[PDB]
Amino acid sequence: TKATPDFPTHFPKSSIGIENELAGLVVAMPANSAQKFGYVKSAQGDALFMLTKDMNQGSYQRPPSLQDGKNYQNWQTHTVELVSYPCEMDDKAAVETRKQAMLWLATHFTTHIDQSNHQPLAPIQSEDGRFVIEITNAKHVIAAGNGISAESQGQTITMTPSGQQATVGVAAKGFGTSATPELRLLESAPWYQKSLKSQFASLTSAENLDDKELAANVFAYLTSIYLKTAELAKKFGIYINEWDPMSEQITPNANGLTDPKVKNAWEILPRTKPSKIVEILSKSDAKAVMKHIKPQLQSRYSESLSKNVFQYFQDGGEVAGHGINNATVGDKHSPELAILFEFRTVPNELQSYLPKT
C-alpha cells in the first residue's frame, strides 16, 4: 500500500515505475514529515529513484548511548522504500541503471549502518562515480533493524523480494485494443471484462458515434472498474458515498477503498482517476458511454449500491486514494491521456524490471 510519483510526466508509448520496500533498516524522521527524504541520480543528472519512508514502525527512541544533544522529540520510525522515477519500458539502459543504482544503494546502506548507525545519509557519489545521492530532507536518521539498539546485528542490506511492486503507464485509448504485450498483460486483470466491448456494440447499433471502437474500449474499462468496486464494497463491507453495507446485512470488514487487502483484491490496481478517460472521447461519445453504464450495475447490484458507485466515479472519485492524473503519452505537443496500474505482486513478465540481489 504506497504513494507513487505525482508530478507531470510524458513518454512516447508506455512507462514503468518500480518499488522496493527494504529489510534490515529503518528511517526515523519528525512526525508528519514528507515521504521523500532524498533521491539517487546518475552522474549525468538523470533522476533514478526516490528514498521514502514506508510503513510506520512506531515512535523513535534515540539509544541512550547515542545521546547527542539533539531533539528526536515526536520522531517516528518507518521502513524505507525505493521508488523509481518512471522510464520507457523499452529503454533497457534506463531500466538497468535503476536496478544497478538500487543494488549499489543497498551496498551503501550496509556500510552506513555499520559505521554511521543512527546518523542521516550524506549526499555522496558512488566509488565508481556512476551514482549520486541527493538529500532532500536532512532531518532524518538511518538505523539498522528496528532502530532500537545503538548497534546493528551486522545486517547486509538487500532488495527485499516481498517488498516489490510495479507501476505501468499506458495510453488510455489503448486499453482494450490488445495492441502491445503490456496492454495484453493489463487486459488479463481478473476484474477486466473484454466481452463488454461486443456488449456495447449491440447496445449502440442505432447510435451514430464519432469513434465506436474507442467508446466500446472506454465503456468496457469503466464498467469493469465500476463493477469491481461494487463487488469489493459487498465482499468487504466498504462505505461508498451514501451506501451503507449494513443496510444490506454486510458486516464492515475493511478500512475503506484504500485498505491494503482491498487494493490486493484488484491484483492490477487502477491508479488513475476513472473520470479522466471521458476526456479522450467527444462530448457526445462520452455521454453515450456514461448513459449505458448504470444498467450494467443495476442488473447486478442494488439501486443504492449502483447509484452510489456510479455517482462516486462520475464526481471524480478515486479507486484507492491520490491518483496519478497528470501523466501523458504520445506526441509531446499533442499528448494523449495516460492511465496507470499498480501490480500489487510483480508477475513473471515484469520480474526483469526489478533489482535482483
Swiss-Prot record:
Main localization (coarse): secreted
Any one GO molecular-function label of the UniProt entry: toxin activity
A GO BP entry: actin filament depolymerization
Binding positions for Mg(2+) 2 per the UniProt entry: E19, E81
Keyword annotations: ATP-binding, Host cytoplasm, Ligase, Magnesium, Metal-binding, Nucleotide-binding, Secreted, Toxin, Virulence
Cellular-component GO terms for this entry: extracellular region; host cell cytoplasm; host cell cytosol
Disruption phenotype: Deletion leads to a loss of TseL secretion and in turn loss of its ability to mediate prey cell killing.
Subcellular location field: Secreted; Host cytoplasm, Host cytosol
Residues reported in the UniProt entry to bind Mg(2+) 1: E19, Q165, E342
Binding site for ATP: S15, I16, G17, I18, E19, S84, R271
The keyword S-adenosyl-L-methionine belongs to this UniProt entry's keyword annotation: no
Record-annotated ACD domain positions: 4-357
Entry similarity comment: Belongs to the VgrG protein family.
Cited function: Part of the type VI secretion system (T6SS) specialized secretion system, which delivers several virulence factors in both prokaryotic and eukaryotic cells during infection. Forms the spike at the tip of the elongating tube probably formed by hemolysin co-regulated protein/Hcp. Allows the delivery of the TseL antibacterial toxin to target cells where it exerts its toxicity. Also acts directly as an actin-directed toxin that catalyzes the covalent cross-linking of host cytoplasmic monomeric actin.
Subunit (UniProt): Interacts with protein VC1417.
Protein name according to UniProt: Actin cross-linking toxin VgrG1
Gene name of this polypeptide: vgrG1
Segment of the intact protein contained: 725 to 1081 of 1163
